[PDB]
C-alpha cells in the first residue's frame, strides 16, 4: 500500500521529454498521452521536433513510466514506482546493443501538478555507422518481455534488468541488454519490493495525420511473480 498509488486510480495525463545524442547526433523527442494503472494501459504519442530521428524508434521505447504498471491486489506491497510519487524517482539506465553502441540514460519521473512527467537525458556511443541502429535496420514492431525487479536497500530503491529482443530486417533479432536503477527523489517512505517482474507488451503504429518523424505507442503491463 502507499498513499502514492492513490494518484493513479484514474486516467492520468502524461508528458514525455527526451534529449538524446547518439554518436554526436542530436535529437529531441516529445510525448503526450495518458495512463491507466487500473488497466496497466498507456496510450502515448511521440514525435521528433528535430527531424528524421537518427536511431530507430524502437531503440527508444524503453527509455520513453513503469508507475503505470498494473499491480495485482496481492501485489500492492511491492510497488516501488507508485509509492515514490508524487515526488517521483530517478531512472537511470545503461543499454548494451549486442555487437554495437550503447545508451546511457538519466531520467526523472514525477508529477508536475496534474501530470505525470518523464524527463530524460540520453547518450549513445560506440555505434556502428553501418549497424542496425545507425543504418536503421530495425523493423517497427515490438516484442513482449519480462522486467525483472529486486530491492536495492542502500540505494533505497530497486535494481532492474531485462534484455530486449529487437526484430532485425534480415529476419533476425538484436539483443538490447538493459541495466536499470530507480531511486526515490523524495524523502517519504517507499515500498522496497520482494523479487518480481513486469509482463510488458507494447504495440507500435503510425498516426496518418502526422508529418514529423513519429511514433504511436501502446503498452500493457501487469506485475507478477
Where are the domains positioned within the chain?
Answer: 1-225
Cα distance between residue 142 and residue 164, in whole Å: 9
Cα distance between residue 166 and residue 176, in whole Å: 7
Method: X-ray
DSSP the chain: --GGGGGGSS-EEEEEEEEEEETTEEEEEEEEEEEETTTTEEEEEEEETTSS-SS-HHHHTTT--GGGSB--GGGGGG-HHHHTTTT-EEEEEEEEETTS-EEEEEEEEEEETTEEEEEEEEEEES--TTSTTTTT-B-S----EEEEEEEETTTTEEEEEEEEEEEBTTS-EEEEEEEEEEEESSSS------SEEEEEEEEEE--TT--SSEEEEEEEEEEE-
Is residue 189 within 8 Å of residue 213, measured between CB atoms?
Answer: no
C-alpha cell at 192: 522496497
Which fold, 1-225?
Green Fluorescent Protein (2.40.155)
Cα–Cα distances in angstroms (integers) from residue 60 to residues 56, 139, 170, in the given order:
7, 13, 20
Resolution of this structure in Å: 2.0
Rg (CA), the chain: 17
Cα distance between residue 176 and residue 189, in whole Å: 33
Amino acid at each position: 500500500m502507499s498513499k502514492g498509488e492513490e494518484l493513479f486510480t484514474g486516467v492520468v495525463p502524461i508528458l514525455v521529454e527526451l534529449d538524446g545524442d547518439v554518436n554526436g547526433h542530436k535529437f529531441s523527442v516529445s510525448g503526450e498521452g495518458e495512463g491507466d494503472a487500473t488497466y496497466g494501459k498507456l496510450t502515448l504519442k511521440f514525435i521528433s521536433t528535430t527531424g528524421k530521428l537518427p536511431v530507430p524508434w524502437p531503440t527508444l521505447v524503453t527509455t520513453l513510466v513503469q508507475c503505470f504498471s498494473r499491480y495485482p491486489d496481492h501485489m500492492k506491497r511491492h510497488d516501488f514506482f507508485k509509492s515514490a510519487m508524487p515526488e517521483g524517482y530517478v531512472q537511470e539506465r545503461t543499454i548494451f546493443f549486442k555487437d554495437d553502441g550503447n545508451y546511457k540514460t538519466r531520467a526523472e519521473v514525477k508529477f508536475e501538478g496534474d501530470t505525470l512527467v518523464n524527463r530524460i537525458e540520453l547518450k549513445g556511443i560506440d555505434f556502428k555507422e553501418d549497424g542496425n541502429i545507425l543504418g536503421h535496420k530495425l523493423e517497427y514492431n515490438y516484442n513482449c518481455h519480462n522486467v525483472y525487479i529486486m530491492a536495492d536497500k542502500q540505494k533505497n530503491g530497486i535494481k532492474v534488468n531485462f534484455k530486449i529482443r529487437h526484430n532485425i530486417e534480415d529476419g533476425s533479432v538484436q539483443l538490447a541488454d538493459h541495466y536499470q536503477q530507480n531511486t526515490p527523489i523524495g524523502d517519504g517512505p517507499v515500498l522496497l519490493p520482494d523479487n518480481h517482474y513486469l509482463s510488458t507488451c507494447s504495440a507500435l503504429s503510425k498516426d496518418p495525420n502526422e508529418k514529423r518523424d513519429h511514433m504511436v505507442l501502446l503498452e500493457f503491463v501487469t506485475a507478477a511473480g
